[PDB]
Amino acid sequence: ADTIVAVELDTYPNTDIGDPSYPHIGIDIKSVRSKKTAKWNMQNGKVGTAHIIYNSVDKRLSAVVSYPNADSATVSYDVDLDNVLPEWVRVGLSASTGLYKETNTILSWSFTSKLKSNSTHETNALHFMFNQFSKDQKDLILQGDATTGTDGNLELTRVSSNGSPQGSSVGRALFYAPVHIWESSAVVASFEATFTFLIKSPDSHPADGIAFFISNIDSSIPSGSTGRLLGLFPDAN
Amino acid sequence: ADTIVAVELDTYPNTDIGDPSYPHIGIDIKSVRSKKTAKWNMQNGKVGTAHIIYNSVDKRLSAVVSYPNADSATVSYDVDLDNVLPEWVRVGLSASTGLYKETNTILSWSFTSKLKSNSTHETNALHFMFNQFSKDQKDLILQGDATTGTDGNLELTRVSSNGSPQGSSVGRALFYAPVHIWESSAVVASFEATFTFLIKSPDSHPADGIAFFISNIDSSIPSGSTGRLLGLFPDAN
Amino acid sequence: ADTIVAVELDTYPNTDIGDPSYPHIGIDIKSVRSKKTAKWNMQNGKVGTAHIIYNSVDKRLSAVVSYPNADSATVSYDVDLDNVLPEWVRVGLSASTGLYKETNTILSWSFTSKLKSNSTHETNALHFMFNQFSKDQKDLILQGDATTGTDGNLELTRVSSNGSPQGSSVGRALFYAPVHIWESSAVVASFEATFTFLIKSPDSHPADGIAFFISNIDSSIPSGSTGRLLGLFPDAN
Amino acid sequence: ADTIVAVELDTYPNTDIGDPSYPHIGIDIKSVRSKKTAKWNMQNGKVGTAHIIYNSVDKRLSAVVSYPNADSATVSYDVDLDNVLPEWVRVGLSASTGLYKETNTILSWSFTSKLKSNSTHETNALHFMFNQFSKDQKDLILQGDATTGTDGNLELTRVSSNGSPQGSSVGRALFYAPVHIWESSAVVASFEATFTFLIKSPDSHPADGIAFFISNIDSSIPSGSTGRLLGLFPDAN
Ligand SMILES: O=C(NCCO[C@H]1O[C@H](CO)[C@@H](O)[C@H](O)[C@@H]1O)c1ccc(-n2cc[n+](-c3ccc(C(=O)NCCO[C@H]4O[C@H](CO)[C@@H](O)[C@H](O)[C@@H]4O)cc3)c2)cc1
Ligand SMILES: O=C(NCCO[C@H]1O[C@H](CO)[C@@H](O)[C@H](O)[C@@H]1O)c1ccc(-n2cc[n+](-c3ccc(C(=O)NCCO[C@H]4O[C@H](CO)[C@@H](O)[C@H](O)[C@@H]4O)cc3)c2)cc1
Ligand SMILES: [Ca+2]
Ligand SMILES: [Ca+2]
Ligand SMILES: [Ca+2]
Ligand SMILES: [Ca+2]
Ligand SMILES: [Mn+2]
Ligand SMILES: [Mn+2]
Ligand SMILES: [Mn+2]
Ligand SMILES: [Mn+2]
């Protein structure tokens, strides 16, 4: 299977597979059963912001999700990603719907990665920023139901023309370029990601959520990963 | 054929195809016959620096090449790259040898591109920096004789183990990711590139040179583009 | 006498001192009498964006002023700013009202300066970005009527409690830190400034405008520089 | 009394005031008595690199000091710098000599500060980079014996014409511009500093070291702060 490190914005409580009873954010290391979760007052129809950060000095993967004029939710897990991920990865956005549904709209995505060497004492670096997405976005790999160009936004899951989200949808977008995420010969490896999202449900209960994820370069949507598996895992182990 | 916009560091005077009699730098728009050239005191065995810049306001493509403690050489050509390049390109380094030869060593390469929109008044951006190159550089597309990992440097053309450059060599390295270089809906499109290079000849006459180039995403070394064609052109037209 | 290089967004034609017959943008080298202007369809009460760029390679100062879903005004002048400016400068925003008036509201301002050279592989840089201003903004020097903190915005000129601008007002905001704007020992000196503004006038005649400027470090508002002199010049020579 | 947060590269063990028995690095919160230290194999006359990082999400100040081809020393402390620092600060480098001495040479210094929030999609930032210092560096406040321009290097403490460091010397360099280091209204506050240094001692006993520090804006060298107090503290409480 793929190797997956993910930060999940999980809108739907699957309490039979370790989810708490409320919308939550979570750090996923090779399982959909988050190693750490925190409560999250997702705001239906509002534009939200996720900030993810990692450095190799702290070995702490942290996420903060906020909306204008609200308390934030933050979650942190101590993990040494040199021991979990390959050296070269891809970075991506993933979302799903199941029996219940939501728009999984991305309005912007940025990402930075840096290696500062010990062997040569010099740095390697990648930064992208999308504030608009276009109909033909040749630096994104779109998988499953994911589309671009509707209002200059990335739609991770299937929406009708009037704007109605479909169930049993799964979708991802990956940056075209492999990223050098770690190097044993380095002093400080670090990355950050930021995206803004709009999750809108006609339902009183939306599902299933959005994740930022780091994977093997060849990662693809595992089979049957709609609903609670968020396009990231083949199963709930 | 490929579409090619190139800045050439041309070490060898092919006066039968429009070259001046001395080492020169040049701006190449779809031909090896530079639209503008300037004299260049290439320093055999010294680490040099090339800076290339473009913005959509000036529509001026400029290059500056310098060595520690020397006069610079600069060249500028007014060109509207929205009228020459496709919207999506790749960026790359190219070099060649022919009857005469030189190391075409790259020690570092950086690149930045930005679109600042008029439709949405928001910006898209890509930045990479290599200060080291590794043996398995998965964000570079290596073509022809190009290799990485020898001293953490990119060797564009074939060098023996003792360090002797071979003739009739051609080589390129392209950033894995397509770049959105222009957009009619934008207010300012701009890019810059920087690389450091070491060109060393045992000869009194080195050849053939190094180029930074922008091409169609699928660009490949045209056939017979060793020597004076620098890996960029199928012919000298 | 201060030394002033400025880009003027000039909302009011003073035809007696060289202004064209319409709202225009202009490059001002040591004089209110623009070396170069371009027609500008200023949009009353709409948020506009200004982009200024200079590089020492083309020795070309350019500006692009734009509004969402409109044509751009752009203006350009060939000038070598080391023949005009001292090595060390402050950067700022100025505005003024006269018999006629307008809000001179700045919602955001960013600035970048680099000196790259050939000592080895290292360069010198400064960058600030204000996307909101606060009531005590200690990295800004406010002069004349300029104030900050009202809706996180810089108000260059006097505005009453109930929203309406005052006549015979003049204000400026300077970045606290001096900027190394040129060095003789550098191969490429460059800078870039961006600001978003809201110019609102109660009636069809608004005055006098906004400028981005570069001055000597101890630059201050010259006497009698309200209205047409934009807070920048003592006289209209 | 100044408010001081500091990372100390401490070359001389003052065991009477809590120093460990060996050269160490240390996180100093309002006291010379480091809250946290780590062994550090200082290399006489070799160029080292210091990396400092803080983010408001982990509330974790970390430092990594390294030399080419050697193990790193790293040190980390959980501290909320809005409970310690005022909102507005200066950043600086300090060094000192006592009965014993060393060059306190800084070859380069860079610094980055960001406040991201949720007003909409905009954030506030500062960034400077010095890769060479000049004889009149107007964006630095030099204090005590600190000087610039000798081989493009910052000399924090007194060095004679013929290369040898002086005892009972103390000097500092502050960035001219105050820094907004925390805001209550922000979701992520972060900063990062990097400097390269050359510590050369004529004999086997060198003293006293270098610190990167953050202080109140009008911070100055306290009385009698040579040697073990590193230019930072009035006393060893
Ligand atoms: O709106 C203005 N100015 C614009 C507003 O400007 C402010 O606001 C602007 C916008 O905020 C800002 O840009 C500016 O910096 C400023 O603050 C303005 C208007 C009038 C002013 N002003 C002051 C005195 N006068 C006078 C006085 C006398 C005569 C006369 O006797 N005229 C008779 C006819 O003259 C003819 O017959 C005579 C006899 O045969 C001859 O002598 C003459 O040669 C001519 O043939 C005219 C004007 C005019 C001053 C400014
Ligand atoms: O190198 C130093 N310091 C290090 C250098 O430091 C500088 O340089 C460093 C490196 O640049 C820097 O870190 C520092 O901040 C500083 O600038 C240093 C060394 C000596 C100093 N100093 C000044 C006066 N004294 C005296 C005076 C008298 C006695 C005595 O009579 N000793 C007799 C034996 O004592 C015993 O018997 C007695 C009688 O029964 C009892 O009373 C006692 O209790 C004990 O049992 C000793 C010391 C010492 C001060 C500093
Ligand atoms: Ca769930
Ligand atoms: Ca040639
Ligand atoms: Ca005017
Ligand atoms: Ca000590
Ligand atoms: Mn979950
Ligand atoms: Mn040529
Ligand atoms: Mn004018
Ligand atoms: Mn200590």
PDB file of C-alpha atoms in Angstrom, chain B residues 54-184:
ATOM      1  CA  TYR B  54      11.942  38.875 -17.269  1.00  0.00           C
ATOM      2  CA  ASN B  55       8.808  40.877 -16.442  1.00  0.00           C
ATOM      3  CA  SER B  56       5.607  41.372 -18.552  1.00  0.00           C
ATOM      4  CA  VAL B  57       5.597  45.175 -17.800  1.00  0.00           C
ATOM      5  CA  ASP B  58       9.079  45.880 -19.377  1.00  0.00           C
ATOM      6  CA  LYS B  59       8.779  42.854 -21.789  1.00  0.00           C
ATOM      7  CA  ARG B  60      12.648  42.869 -21.542  1.00  0.00           C
ATOM      8  CA  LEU B  61      14.613  39.547 -21.168  1.00  0.00           C
ATOM      9  CA  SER B  62      17.984  40.339 -19.521  1.00  0.00           C
ATOM     10  CA  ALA B  63      21.020  38.270 -18.429  1.00  0.00           C
ATOM     11  CA  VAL B  64      24.114  39.205 -16.379  1.00  0.00           C
ATOM     12  CA  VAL B  65      27.150  36.883 -16.087  1.00  0.00           C
ATOM     13  CA  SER B  66      29.939  37.695 -13.621  1.00  0.00           C
ATOM     14  CA  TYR B  67      32.960  36.077 -11.909  1.00  0.00           C
ATOM     15  CA  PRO B  68      34.492  37.222  -8.541  1.00  0.00           C
ATOM     16  CA  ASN B  69      36.552  40.460  -9.063  1.00  0.00           C
ATOM     17  CA  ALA B  70      35.721  40.998 -12.797  1.00  0.00           C
ATOM     18  CA  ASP B  71      33.573  43.264 -14.988  1.00  0.00           C
ATOM     19  CA  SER B  72      30.143  41.707 -15.790  1.00  0.00           C
ATOM     20  CA  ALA B  73      28.665  41.007 -19.253  1.00  0.00           C
ATOM     21  CA  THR B  74      24.946  41.832 -19.698  1.00  0.00           C
ATOM     22  CA  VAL B  75      22.559  41.454 -22.657  1.00  0.00           C
ATOM     23  CA  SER B  76      18.911  42.602 -23.016  1.00  0.00           C
ATOM     24  CA  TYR B  77      16.334  42.023 -25.752  1.00  0.00           C
ATOM     25  CA  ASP B  78      12.787  43.497 -25.917  1.00  0.00           C
ATOM     26  CA  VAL B  79      10.511  40.513 -26.518  1.00  0.00           C
ATOM     27  CA  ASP B  80       6.902  39.729 -25.568  1.00  0.00           C
ATOM     28  CA  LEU B  81       7.193  36.070 -24.399  1.00  0.00           C
ATOM     29  CA  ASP B  82       3.293  35.776 -24.330  1.00  0.00           C
ATOM     30  CA  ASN B  83       3.729  35.751 -28.206  1.00  0.00           C
ATOM     31  CA  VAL B  84       6.592  33.159 -28.438  1.00  0.00           C
ATOM     32  CA  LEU B  85       6.122  30.529 -25.646  1.00  0.00           C
ATOM     33  CA  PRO B  86       3.075  28.397 -24.817  1.00  0.00           C
ATOM     34  CA  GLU B  87       1.340  29.324 -21.461  1.00  0.00           C
ATOM     35  CA  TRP B  88       2.821  26.187 -19.807  1.00  0.00           C
ATOM     36  CA  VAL B  89       6.538  25.431 -20.252  1.00  0.00           C
ATOM     37  CA  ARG B  90       9.517  23.692 -18.642  1.00  0.00           C
ATOM     38  CA  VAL B  91      12.741  25.393 -17.559  1.00  0.00           C
ATOM     39  CA  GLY B  92      16.121  23.771 -18.026  1.00  0.00           C
ATOM     40  CA  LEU B  93      19.906  23.859 -18.375  1.00  0.00           C
ATOM     41  CA  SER B  94      21.559  22.577 -21.627  1.00  0.00           C
ATOM     42  CA  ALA B  95      25.232  22.199 -22.695  1.00  0.00           C
ATOM     43  CA  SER B  96      27.287  20.645 -25.556  1.00  0.00           C
ATOM     44  CA  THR B  97      30.808  19.790 -26.760  1.00  0.00           C
ATOM     45  CA  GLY B  98      31.839  19.058 -30.386  1.00  0.00           C
ATOM     46  CA  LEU B  99      35.331  18.735 -31.867  1.00  0.00           C
ATOM     47  CA  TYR B 100      36.451  20.865 -28.805  1.00  0.00           C
ATOM     48  CA  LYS B 101      35.294  20.302 -25.191  1.00  0.00           C
ATOM     49  CA  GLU B 102      34.871  21.709 -21.631  1.00  0.00           C
ATOM     50  CA  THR B 103      33.347  20.629 -18.288  1.00  0.00           C
ATOM     51  CA  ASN B 104      29.763  22.029 -18.179  1.00  0.00           C
ATOM     52  CA  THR B 105      29.477  21.866 -14.368  1.00  0.00           C
ATOM     53  CA  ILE B 106      26.438  23.352 -12.510  1.00  0.00           C
ATOM     54  CA  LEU B 107      27.059  23.937  -8.718  1.00  0.00           C
ATOM     55  CA  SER B 108      23.616  25.539  -7.975  1.00  0.00           C
ATOM     56  CA  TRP B 109      20.397  26.552  -9.796  1.00  0.00           C
ATOM     57  CA  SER B 110      17.422  28.597  -8.525  1.00  0.00           C
ATOM     58  CA  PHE B 111      14.237  29.803 -10.318  1.00  0.00           C
ATOM     59  CA  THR B 112      11.156  31.900  -9.427  1.00  0.00           C
ATOM     60  CA  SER B 113       7.967  32.566 -11.503  1.00  0.00           C
ATOM     61  CA  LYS B 114       4.891  34.660 -10.422  1.00  0.00           C
ATOM     62  CA  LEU B 115       1.481  35.565 -11.965  1.00  0.00           C
ATOM     63  CA  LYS B 116      -0.418  38.516 -10.342  1.00  0.00           C
ATOM     64  CA  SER B 117      -4.017  38.382 -11.689  1.00  0.00           C
ATOM     65  CA  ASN B 118      -6.428  41.041 -13.012  1.00  0.00           C
ATOM     66  CA  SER B 119      -9.548  38.785 -13.024  1.00  0.00           C
ATOM     67  CA  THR B 120      -9.195  37.829  -9.330  1.00  0.00           C
ATOM     68  CA  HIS B 121      -6.332  40.129  -8.228  1.00  0.00           C
ATOM     69  CA  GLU B 122      -4.448  37.130  -6.610  1.00  0.00           C
ATOM     70  CA  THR B 123      -0.998  35.554  -7.309  1.00  0.00           C
ATOM     71  CA  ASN B 124       0.332  32.065  -8.401  1.00  0.00           C
ATOM     72  CA  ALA B 125       4.033  31.202  -7.727  1.00  0.00           C
ATOM     73  CA  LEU B 126       6.790  28.547  -8.094  1.00  0.00           C
ATOM     74  CA  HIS B 127      10.311  28.745  -6.574  1.00  0.00           C
ATOM     75  CA  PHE B 128      12.957  25.998  -6.506  1.00  0.00           C
ATOM     76  CA  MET B 129      16.584  26.207  -5.270  1.00  0.00           C
ATOM     77  CA  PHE B 130      19.265  23.492  -5.623  1.00  0.00           C
ATOM     78  CA  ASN B 131      22.547  24.316  -3.811  1.00  0.00           C
ATOM     79  CA  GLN B 132      23.388  20.558  -3.767  1.00  0.00           C
ATOM     80  CA  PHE B 133      22.296  17.942  -6.388  1.00  0.00           C
ATOM     81  CA  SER B 134      22.078  14.247  -5.341  1.00  0.00           C
ATOM     82  CA  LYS B 135      22.643  10.935  -7.239  1.00  0.00           C
ATOM     83  CA  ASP B 136      18.844  10.418  -7.479  1.00  0.00           C
ATOM     84  CA  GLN B 137      17.333  13.887  -8.170  1.00  0.00           C
ATOM     85  CA  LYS B 138      13.611  12.989  -8.730  1.00  0.00           C
ATOM     86  CA  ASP B 139      12.558  16.678  -9.349  1.00  0.00           C
ATOM     87  CA  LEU B 140      14.982  16.882 -12.352  1.00  0.00           C
ATOM     88  CA  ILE B 141      14.400  15.326 -15.824  1.00  0.00           C
ATOM     89  CA  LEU B 142      17.937  14.375 -17.054  1.00  0.00           C
ATOM     90  CA  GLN B 143      18.320  13.996 -20.858  1.00  0.00           C
ATOM     91  CA  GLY B 144      21.321  13.042 -23.056  1.00  0.00           C
ATOM     92  CA  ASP B 145      24.649  12.779 -21.136  1.00  0.00           C
ATOM     93  CA  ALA B 146      23.538  14.831 -18.025  1.00  0.00           C
ATOM     94  CA  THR B 147      24.343  13.298 -14.588  1.00  0.00           C
ATOM     95  CA  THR B 148      24.130  14.303 -10.889  1.00  0.00           C
ATOM     96  CA  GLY B 149      25.899  13.287  -7.649  1.00  0.00           C
ATOM     97  CA  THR B 150      29.529  13.767  -8.647  1.00  0.00           C
ATOM     98  CA  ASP B 151      30.569  16.255  -5.844  1.00  0.00           C
ATOM     99  CA  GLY B 152      26.862  17.198  -5.430  1.00  0.00           C
ATOM    100  CA  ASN B 153      27.043  18.915  -8.854  1.00  0.00           C
ATOM    101  CA  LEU B 154      25.075  18.533 -12.090  1.00  0.00           C
ATOM    102  CA  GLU B 155      27.389  17.491 -14.972  1.00  0.00           C
ATOM    103  CA  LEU B 156      25.517  18.521 -18.170  1.00  0.00           C
ATOM    104  CA  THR B 157      28.120  16.835 -20.484  1.00  0.00           C
ATOM    105  CA  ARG B 158      30.202  13.612 -20.168  1.00  0.00           C
ATOM    106  CA  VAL B 159      33.316  13.809 -17.929  1.00  0.00           C
ATOM    107  CA  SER B 160      35.720  10.862 -17.251  1.00  0.00           C
ATOM    108  CA  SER B 161      36.438   9.765 -13.583  1.00  0.00           C
ATOM    109  CA  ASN B 162      39.829  11.672 -13.487  1.00  0.00           C
ATOM    110  CA  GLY B 163      37.840  14.797 -14.641  1.00  0.00           C
ATOM    111  CA  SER B 164      38.467  14.923 -18.486  1.00  0.00           C
ATOM    112  CA  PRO B 165      35.600  16.325 -20.615  1.00  0.00           C
ATOM    113  CA  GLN B 166      34.481  14.400 -23.746  1.00  0.00           C
ATOM    114  CA  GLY B 167      33.693  15.846 -27.231  1.00  0.00           C
ATOM    115  CA  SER B 168      30.433  15.187 -29.174  1.00  0.00           C
ATOM    116  CA  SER B 169      28.551  15.294 -25.782  1.00  0.00           C
ATOM    117  CA  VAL B 170      25.089  16.925 -25.224  1.00  0.00           C
ATOM    118  CA  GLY B 171      23.050  17.093 -22.012  1.00  0.00           C
ATOM    119  CA  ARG B 172      20.133  18.822 -20.316  1.00  0.00           C
ATOM    120  CA  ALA B 173      18.328  19.026 -16.931  1.00  0.00           C
ATOM    121  CA  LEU B 174      14.653  20.237 -16.734  1.00  0.00           C
ATOM    122  CA  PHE B 175      12.610  21.017 -13.591  1.00  0.00           C
ATOM    123  CA  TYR B 176      10.067  18.192 -13.247  1.00  0.00           C
ATOM    124  CA  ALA B 177       7.148  20.642 -12.927  1.00  0.00           C
ATOM    125  CA  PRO B 178       5.521  22.546 -15.801  1.00  0.00           C
ATOM    126  CA  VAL B 179       5.549  26.339 -15.022  1.00  0.00           C
ATOM    127  CA  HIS B 180       2.596  28.697 -15.811  1.00  0.00           C
ATOM    128  CA  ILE B 181       4.803  31.379 -17.486  1.00  0.00           C
ATOM    129  CA  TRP B 182       2.013  33.710 -18.703  1.00  0.00           C
ATOM    130  CA  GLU B 183      -1.738  34.310 -18.462  1.00  0.00           C
ATOM    131  CA  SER B 184      -3.693  36.980 -20.485  1.00  0.00           C
TER     132      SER B 184
END
